[PDB]
């Protein structure tokens, strides 16, 4: 996997490739690695497909039950639940999750949760095997308070490089835009992003 989430002026955008693998075979070339845990709290999944699916299902259940009693949860609260599962079951999990959501008070927020189960709040986050190849690029190019179109280009150019170098990454580039306007899904095909 190559995944990333990036805060910007109007909120936050999540981005991901669509490749799932068993060794060198591509079991699914159109995977959806960006998943909904709440109306405007989404996560990017990396590591084991089974583990991250099971975790995301449990978190969605917890936040649904939270909403029934206490109303809309914060993005921090969502990241805390992800952490609790990842930390307490660190011995039996291979999950690298990026949590991203939009509050109206807090605007766009990004929390990354690596293997150990630690929580790190950041302006933008990258993760997955293909992220290694773009640390240099992303650090040099990221700016705070970007526009929607700039952030979309930043993610598209970043994942394009990650996909190019990482064999475990490829297919289409899916994106999910989280703002006060609502939720928008974007897709970008090889013919476009490969020749960037």
């Amino acid at each position: 996997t190559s995944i990333m989430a990036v805060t910007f002026k109007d909120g936050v955008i999540l981005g991901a490739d669509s490749r799932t693998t068993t060794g060198a075979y591509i079991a699914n070339r159109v995977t959806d690695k960006l998943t909904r845990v709440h109306d405007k709290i989404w996560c990017c999944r990396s590591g084991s497909a089974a583990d991250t699916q099971a975790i995301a299902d449990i978190v969605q259940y917890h936040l649904e039950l939270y909403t029934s009693q206490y109303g809309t949860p914060s993005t921090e609260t969502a990241a805390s639940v992800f952490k609790e599962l990842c930390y307490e079951n660190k011995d039996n999990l291979t999950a690298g999750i990026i949590v991203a959501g939009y509050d109206d008070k807090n605007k766009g927020e990004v929390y990354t949760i690596p293997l150990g189960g630690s929580v790190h709040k950041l302006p933008y986050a990258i993760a997955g095997s293909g992220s290694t190849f773009i640390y240099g690029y992303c650090d040099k190019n990221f700016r705070e308070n970007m526009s929607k179109e700039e952030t979309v280009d930043f993610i598209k150019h970043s994942l394009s490089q990650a996909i190019k170098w990482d064999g475990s990454s490829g297919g289409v580039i899916r994106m999910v835009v989280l703002t006060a306007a609502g939720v928008e899904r974007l897709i970008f095909y090889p013919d476009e992003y490969e020749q960037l």
């Binding site: 799932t20 075979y25 699914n28 995977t31 084991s48 497909a49 089974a50 699916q53 099971a54 039996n92």
Partner: protein, 222 residues
């Protein structure tokens, strides 16, 4: 095993070969890999034969009780959720690899489940040892907006690819067509392209050939 699933206009079709192996030995030349979870939700299973049969029957049982409890026709996502949570709990020790398909009040659906509990969505899928031969065909000939008869042709062709090219797969092609608004039609031995040729000789022995030491009538009655 080679098993496939293909989505079309008004529903979904799944198919499978009919070979069961025991190492390099063909244990069953005409086994049924297509399983009924509910009347209009069917399952194709690769991997450990006892695990696919057992997990399909258990979830099928719980789906029936759930259907009766809710007074509703069962949904594919319910079977999908129950299967994946069961398999995940056992950490891949239950070696069931399933293609789940069917129609319900929500619409037509096609999923695959792996032994560790991960699920995928698609318009065309293949699992088993012959999945690469099958997926090669599916990737070559699949298009959007397939008809019923086109999907059956594509599915069976993807199974045939496994039959001929994979040593794990062979014999016949079973098909199940699940169309919306209609009863699901299970087509057992839809194709039989591996009939055994006439033998060169009858091996009927003259009566008395086998040497016998003792005879005795066995009592089966009470």
């Amino acid at each position: 095993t080679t098993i496939v699933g293909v989505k079309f206009n008004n529903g979904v079709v799944i198919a499978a070969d009919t070979r069961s192996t025991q190492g390099p030995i063909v244990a069953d030349k005409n086994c049924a890999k297509l399983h009924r979870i509910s009347p209009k939700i069917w399952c194709a299973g690769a991997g450990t034969a006892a695990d696919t049969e057992a997990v399909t029957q258990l979830i099928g049982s719980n789906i029936e009780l759930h259907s009766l409890y809710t007074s509703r026709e069962p949904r594919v996502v319910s079977a999908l959720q129950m299967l994946k949570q069961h398999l995940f709990k056992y950490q891949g020790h239950i070696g069931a690899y399933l293609i789940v398909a069917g129609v319900d009040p929500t619409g037509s659906h096609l999923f695959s489940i792996h032994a560790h509990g991960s699920t995928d969505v698609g318009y065309y899928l293949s699992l088993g040892s012959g999945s690469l031969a099958a997926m090669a065909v599916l990737e070559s000939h699949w298009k959007q907006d397939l008809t019923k008869e086109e999907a059956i042709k594509l599915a069976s062709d993807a199974i045939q690819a496994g039959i001929w090219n994979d040593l794990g797969s062979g014999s016949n092609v079973d098909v199940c067509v699940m169309e919306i608004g209609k009863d699901a039609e299970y087509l057992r031995n839809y194709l039989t392209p591996n009939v055994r040729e006439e033998k060169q000789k009858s091996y009927k022995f003259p009566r008395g050939t086998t040497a016998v030491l003792k005879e005795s009538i066995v009592n089966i009655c009470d």
